[PDB]
């Protein structure tokens, strides 16, 4: 979408993969942010972010 | 009593964007974007205090050869420059064995 | 690809999801099953069976 519109996709994409937050081993912060991500994942607020940023 | 943490993120233009007043702002104000307002929402639920920082290597970066010792962005966690990563980064076991990951937020 | 060959896909995949083997809540064999799944995955038998059948 960032003009010039001189680039295009071809092919039906290659694979399926996830993006997520990460945290080093033993860090106490991990699960208390993971539950917040789970909240957002089930509340769907991410759709607002996707709209805003694409 | 009080506690704070340092966060790693990256200036991929869909995910983080440099606000025009880029001369002197702090990372908690320098930036906007999907990672930035996701992080803000997460901090809104979890309440912890933090500061955003760019990955100091500024890149994904490779394994160290034969050692597989980390690139900048993972080493900054394991070696304590930061304590959490909120970035467009692919989940894989070759990373999961070393550090924990959230539930994925997107599938792509 | 079956004999009639009279139908076809259109477009790419709409999303992504995955399968897992399932059992009632707390089924004690479930963790042995998870180990079996992990070993058959590491052994590449998930290709072997698919490579036979497709």
């Amino acid at each position: 979408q960032r003009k010039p519109c001189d680039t295009m996709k071809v092919g039906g994409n290659l694979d399926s993969k996830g993006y997520g937050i990460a945290t080093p081993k033993g860090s106490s912060l991990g699960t208390p942010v993971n539950l917040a991500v789970l909240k957002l994942s089930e509340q769907g607020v991410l759709d607002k972010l996707k709209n805003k940023w694409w | 009593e009080q506690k704070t943490v340092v966060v790693t993120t990256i200036l991929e233009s869909p995910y983080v964007m440099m606000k025009k007043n880029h001369e002197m702002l702090e990372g908690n104000e320098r930036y906007e974007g999907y990672c930035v307002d996701l992080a803000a929402e997460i901090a809104k639920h979890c309440g912890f205090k933090y500061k955003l920082t760019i990955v100091g290597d500024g890149k994904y970066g490779a394994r160290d050869a034969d050692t597989k010792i980390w690139n900048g962005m993972v080493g900054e966690l394991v070696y304590g420059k930061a304590d959490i990563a909120i970035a467009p980064l692919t989940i894989t076991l070759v990373r999961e064995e070393v550090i924990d990951f959230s539930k994925p937020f997107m599938s792509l």
Side-chain angles (χ1 to χ4, degrees), chain A, chain B:
Chain A
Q1 301 297 331
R2 302 289 71 76
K3 306 211 184 82
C5 312
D6 77 335
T7 62
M8 55 169 51
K9 180 181 297 181
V10 295
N13 71 8
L14 181 65
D15 71 351
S16 296
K17 301 189 306 308
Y19 280 2
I21 285 181
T23 291
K25 299 292 181 180
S27 181
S28 185
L29 184 59
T31 193
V33 303
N34 189 39
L35 69 89
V37 176
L38 288 163
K39 283 179 176 183
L40 303 187
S41 77
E42 69 193 341
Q43 293 169 11
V45 173
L46 307 181
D47 298 354
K48 174 59 59 67
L49 318 184
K50 197 76 195 173
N51 298 352
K52 186 177 179 188
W53 301 115
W54 285 261
Chain B
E1 294 191 331
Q2 301 85 353
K3 183 61 181 179
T4 57
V5 302
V6 179
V7 188
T8 47
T9 198
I10 184 63
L11 282 159
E12 293 276 36
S13 308
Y15 297 91
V16 187
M17 284 131 282
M18 182 85 267
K19 190 179 287 157
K20 186 55 55 66
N21 199 358
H22 65 286
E23 306 95 324
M24 52 179 288
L25 290 173
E26 172 60 26
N28 286 1
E29 189 53 40
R30 274 185 186 211
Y31 303 124
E32 66 186 322
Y34 185 93
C35 283
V36 190
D37 60 17
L38 189 150
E41 182 69 13
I42 291 294
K44 196 189 78 192
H45 290 288
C46 194
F48 73 105
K49 293 298 94 177
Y50 67 96
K51 61 168 283 164
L52 306 183
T53 68
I54 59 171
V55 174
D57 199 11
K59 69 179 65 65
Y60 305 99
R63 278 82 176 95
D64 179 32
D66 302 336
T67 74
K68 302 97 191 174
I69 290 167
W70 288 102
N71 60 26
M73 50 171 46
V74 172
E76 282 168 51
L77 299 184
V78 182
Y79 314 126
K81 185 271 198 164
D83 213 355
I84 170 168
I86 309 184
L89 187 68
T90 311
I91 299 301
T92 178
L93 176 61
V94 173
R95 293 179 178 157
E96 187 186 335
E97 70 175 23
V98 190
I99 67 179
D100 296 337
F101 290 85
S102 71
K103 186 75 178 187
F105 56 78
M106 270 194 293
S107 306
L108 56 79

